[PDB]
Design a protein around this nucleic acid. Structure first.
Length: 1017
DNA sequence: AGCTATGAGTGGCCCCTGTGGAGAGAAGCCTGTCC
DNA sequence: GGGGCCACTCATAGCT
RNA sequence: GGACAGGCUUCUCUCCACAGGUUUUAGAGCUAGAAAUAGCAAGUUAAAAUAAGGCUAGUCCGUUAUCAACUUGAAAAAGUGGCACCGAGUCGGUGCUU
């Protein structure tokens, strides 16, 4: 006999509750086989549980970092282009200059050439640094001086300008000397560059030099004043790097804001600090040259300085004169946003169409990359396909055909009432055409009043007309038709159906592109039909937005019997006058049959595909996938007999989950090709279950344990079955008080960044990771704290001691994400590289994160990483304590009748002895499985100290207390005024003799491996 | 004894950031018309 | 939020 | 229940750029003192890297999603675990089939 049963589900962002109920609301318990090498061959478990997993993440960070990588690569490419241009002449002046620049990061020992990068001799380096303290002095010198300068300094200036060329937020050419545009540019440049009194061709360099000079003067003044009045604080301000003083502001990591915050109170304590304080209020005291404000500098200033240098120094160096435009274009060029990556087919993010297989360089970008086709592909891929015809692209919203479709569809259901007419009548096709020609082609917006006054009253000679279905105006508007009539000024050209394709292409071109040059290029094909004025006016009009119906759907598909399209039927359909919905749903026409052919159901469709097609944050998609797998495994458990009812609650996403479950469950088709719905998919709202809990006193407290998800799923199923359909309440209370609930933490292999992104200074440690292959961390520093992908149990021998003696060992080794590929390629070589010898390959066990181990007395631990464990046991608290805690916590916030509130208050007051019982149970559970003796003693002392506090405060602080025994990583908590630090389990040796547990997604199937029998001494 | 080492434990600190431009879409609030 | 890392102090196992 | 149009908000995905931050090196520290150290001078900039690197050699790609165990599979993927009753502190006991 097949036992009828129903499955309840609770879907969240982090958990998926599942419960199996029979027709009598009982939860059956079955005896399951256990595999492995342990003696426990059979375990009895209840059919209720919850699944827990880490939340899914969005793709934002990956996109940001990928874009950053591309920017860095292209900047390096610009530098390489400049060096390639200069190489031939730099060979004659100083051959090894570029090698010195390239290897400057290395220490003195590892450098191949002389250590000084610029000149290679100390006297010239010192002279250069004295004459040009900052690069801006060199830039101004090269801008103004007419003397022949050393080519190396010219390269330094040009590279400095190219590498930091500035933003591109302003198009066109900008006048640095600043109609109303001149003033708008002048106030704009006022903040960018401040005060250029003496005439200088390069203003930015002059401003930076002014800032440096003011910095020097103010620093000298501050030193003098501090030394005169406050001798004791001189060392603190100018020597101590760990403070926020000037020493920390320059040689330390202190920011400008912190430096000002520290220095302001001291300045007020000294005399003669009026100017310094005024500057400090302006954020201009002792300011650096390289600050975060420079983000507002337009690239035109740098371009002007570059051009000035190239003009000044061209007479001495012939190669600069020939390559001036190349150097300028290196700075000015960027890849247009619609072009995308310049990938050669081998990138999934690419859409560029390349004309010739040459290498794309800034000097020949125009000749190689098809810009117009690239823009078309950029704007076409994102647009949604037509639902009725999945293989056809949708039309633009402002397309003429779309507007005609809307007008004819709206006029289809218009009813008019005249004198002598017993019933409202539909407008005929001739009437619709006449109305369109008279008003819709003459008025941008046509109102019901205008229609009645103009067409019925004047043409049809009807004095009184009543119209239904349209409210004071028609929504459809022929705005595009009016715009084209205004521009082209040819009514016959617009009214000719032979010109439909040309107008459609013109509208599509206007919608697709936003650069005027591309629009001009594509419209050039139709320049023979229009004059120059019409052509230029067309290039100015722009439309935005896309429609929902394709051209093939409206005017492309033709009925086999009649030959009319949907648009044609809307124009005239006889007495039927069927709208778009009726036309597509009419069985008498081939339209319905063609549409039914058009939809294709997924034949062997992958579930992940349809889930990815859904809309929403990826976390809910992960939850949906987990829910579906849970349902599949539950069906597998019950003998593959599909359940009668499925109740879910979480609303389009919920309906999508419902459709997925319906499609997977109900598949058999009857003799009439109709779906045989053996399984009913049910959607409920959590308000019903919440009211059910509040009415029948099934209170839940989320801070106690994780059983609440399973209880919510069980209540969902019970409520759904009861609604759609003493003993029942007793059964419910028995079920909700069960101690055994299957909680499973989904094991996941960690992925992501290799380690933390902060680069740390050099230090004698073996835990620093090199930034490059040849960069020893003891000399150059590097990254730290790699994230372990997964741990592997290793049984081998290690040479220990100074004598290098072989000792048999058994320990957990953590594989970092960086080494995952190398380890999976050949585990033996990787293990040998770490010093392990005589490795037994068959004993390598893959242990992902949150692997569950069992210990004595039922104590359980989950493997958080190679060196830290997490609590793995759930506290089973009797329901009466949960109810008392809920009632006491909301003691002053109960929402109900006064009699019920008084009854709850009395019940709280009478059972005050429950507090000591709760404390005792917490202590017993902690002593059994937590082993937090010091923290437990602190908790007990704090409870004893505050034993006279009001009941509500006691309950509120006790609710916080269950953080100690909660599943997962330990967390700190506050109990009254005393703070308890977290107890971390920083040793993994105890699990080397534990019983490893492998659990299926529901936890019903187990495979227990006892590691104590592996790798004995 | 006399000395060494080491691992084990405990307490505390640490974690890359700021912005601009272009486009495409759904989903949730309301109205109107329909199936 | 939670794992990694370091300074510090201690017991215990190891070697002489 | 779904579709179309109109008014508002939020979120999801892709591309182009910018400014910082961090790391090492270069910017001859001086004096007295064996040294510890004490005094004085100076401080604002620059080069390179910015996930190790990969082959498909591109001015491309590298942090999203997916993953209990055993057998078959490159992978996707497929296959593998008796029933009922009485009880309940992480599940136990009993009876039948086999």
């Amino acid at each position: 006999m097949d036992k009828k049963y129903s499955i309840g589900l609770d879907i969240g962002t982090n958990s998926v509750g599942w419960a199996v109920i029979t027709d009598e609301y009982k939860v059956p318990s079955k005896k399951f086989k256990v595999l492995g090498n342990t003696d426990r061959h059979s375990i009895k478990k209840n059919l209720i549980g919850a699944l827990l997993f880490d939340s899914g993440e969005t793709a934002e960070a990956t996109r940001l970092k990928r874009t950053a990588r591309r920017r860095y690569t292209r900047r390096k490419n610009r530098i390489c282009y400049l060096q390639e241009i200069f190489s031939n002449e730099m060979a004659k002046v100083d051959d090894s200059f570029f090698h010195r620049l390239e290897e400057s990061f290395l220490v003195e020992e590892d450098k191949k050439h002389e250590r000084h990068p610029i000149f290679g001799n100390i006297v010239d380096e010192v002279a250069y640094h004295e004459k040009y303290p900052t690069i801006y002095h060199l830039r101004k010198k090269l801008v103004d001086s007419t003397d022949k300068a050393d080519l190396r300094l010219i390269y330094l200036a040009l590279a400095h300008m190219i590498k930091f060329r500035g933003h591109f937020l302003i198009e066109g050419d900008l006048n640095p000397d600043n109609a109303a545009k001149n003033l708008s540019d002048a106030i704009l440049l006022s903040d960018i560059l401040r005060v250029n009194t003496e005439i200088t061709k390069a203003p930015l360099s002059a401003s930076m030099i002014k800032r440096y000079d003011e910095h020097h003067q103010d620093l000298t003044l501050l030193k003098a004043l501090v030394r005169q009045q406050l001798p004791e604080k001189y060392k603190e301000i100018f020597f101590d790097q760990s403070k926020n003083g000037y020493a920390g502001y320059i040689d330390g990591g202190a920011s400008q804001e912190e430096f000002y915050k520290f220095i302001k109170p001291i300045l007020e304590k000294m005399d003669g600090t009026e100017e310094l304080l005024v500057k400090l209020n302006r954020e201009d005291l002792l300011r650096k040259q390289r600050t975060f404000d420079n983000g507002s500098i337009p690239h035109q200033i740098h371009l002007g300085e570059l051009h000035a240098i190239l003009r000044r120094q061209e007479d001495f160096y012939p190669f600069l004169k020939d390559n001036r435009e190349k150097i300028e274009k290196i700075l000015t060029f960027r890849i247009p946003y619609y072009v995308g990556p310049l990938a050669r087919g081998n990138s999934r993010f690419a859409w560029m169409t390349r004309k010739s297989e040459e290498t794309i360089t800034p000097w020949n970008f125009e000749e190689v990359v098809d810009k117009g086709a690239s823009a078309q592909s950029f704007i076409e891929r994102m647009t949604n396909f037509d639902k009725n015809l999945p293989n056809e692209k949708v039309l633009p919203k402002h397309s003429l055909l779309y507007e005609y479709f809307t007008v004819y569809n709206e006029l289809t259901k218009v009813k008019y009432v005249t004198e002598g007419m017993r019933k409202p009548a539909f407008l005929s096709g001739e009437q619709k055409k006449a109305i369109v020609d008279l008003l819709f082609k003459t008025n941008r917006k046509v109102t019901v009043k205008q229609l009645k006054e103009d067409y019925f009253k004047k043409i049809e000679c009807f004095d009184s007309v009543e119209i239904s279905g349209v409210e004071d105006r028609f929504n459809a508007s022929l705005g595009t038709y009016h715009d084209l009539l205004k521009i082209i000024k040819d009514k016959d050209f617009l009214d000719n159906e032979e010109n439909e394709d040309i107008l459609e292409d013109i509208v599509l071109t206007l919608t697709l592109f936003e650069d005027r040059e591309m629009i001009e290029e594509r419209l050039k094909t139709y320049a023979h039909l229009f004059d120059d004025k019409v052509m230029k006016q067309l290039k100015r009009r722009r439309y935005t937005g896309w429609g929902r119906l394709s051209r093939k759907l409206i005017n492309g598909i033709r009925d086999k019997q009649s030959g009319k399209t949907i648009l044609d039927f809307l124009k005239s359909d006889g007495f039927a006058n069927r709208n778009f919905m009726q036309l597509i749903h009419d069985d008498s026409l081939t339209f319905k049959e063609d549409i039914q052919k058009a939809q294709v159901s997924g034949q062997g469709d992958s579930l992940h595909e349809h889930i990815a097609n859904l809309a929403g944050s990826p976390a809910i998609k992960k939850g949906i996938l987990q829910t579906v797998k849970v349902v599949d495994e539950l069906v597998k458990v019950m003998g593959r007999h599909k359940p009668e009812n499925i109740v879910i609650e979480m609303r389009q996403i919920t309906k999508h989950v419902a459709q997925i479950l319906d499609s997977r469950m109900n598949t058999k088709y009857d003799e009439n090709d109709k779906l045989i719905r053996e399984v009913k998919v049910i959607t409920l709202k959590s308000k019903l279950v919440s009211d059910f809990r509040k009415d029948f006193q099934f209170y839940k407290v989320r801070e106690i344990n994780n059983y609440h998800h399973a209880h919510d799923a069980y209540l969902n199923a019970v409520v759904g079955t009861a609604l759609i359909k003493g003993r029942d309440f007793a059964t419910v209370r028995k079920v909700l008080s069960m101690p055994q609930v299957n909680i499973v933490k989904k094991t996941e292999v960690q992925t992501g960044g290799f380690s933390k992104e902060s680069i740390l200074p050099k230090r004698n440690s073996d835990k620093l990771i090199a930034r490059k292959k040849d960069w020893d961390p003891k000399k150059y520093g590097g990254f730290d704290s790699p994230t372990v992908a997964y741990s592997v149990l290793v049984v081998a021998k290690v040479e220990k001691g100074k004598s290098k003696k072989l000792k048999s060992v058994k320990e957990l080794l953590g594989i970092t994400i960086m080494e995952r590929s190398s380890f999976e390629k050949n585990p033996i070589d990787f293990l040998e590289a770490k010093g392990y010898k005589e490795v037994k390959k068959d004993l390598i066990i893959k242990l992902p994160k949150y692997s569950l181990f069992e210990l004595e007395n039922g104590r359980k631990r989950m493997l958080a990483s190679a060196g830290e464990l997490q609590k793995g046991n759930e506290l089973a608290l009797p329901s009466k304590y949960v109810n008392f805690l809920y009632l006491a916590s909301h003691y002053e916030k109960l929402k109900g009748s006064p009699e019920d509130n008084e009854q709850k208050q009395l019940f709280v007051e009478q059972h005050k002895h429950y507090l000591d019982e709760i404390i005792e149970q917490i202590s017993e559970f902690s002593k059994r499985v937590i082993l937090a003796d010091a923290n437990l003693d602190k908790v007990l002392s704090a409870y004893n100290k505050h034993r006279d506090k009001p009941i509500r405060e006691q309950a509120e602080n006790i609710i916080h207390l269950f953080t100690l025994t909660n599943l997962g990583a330990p967390a700190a908590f506050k109990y009254f005024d005393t703070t308890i630090d977290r107890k971390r389990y920083t040793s993994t040796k105890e699990v080397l003799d534990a019983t490893l547990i492998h659990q299926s997604i529901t936890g019903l199937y187990e495979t227990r491996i006892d590691l104590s029998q592996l790798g004995g001494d």
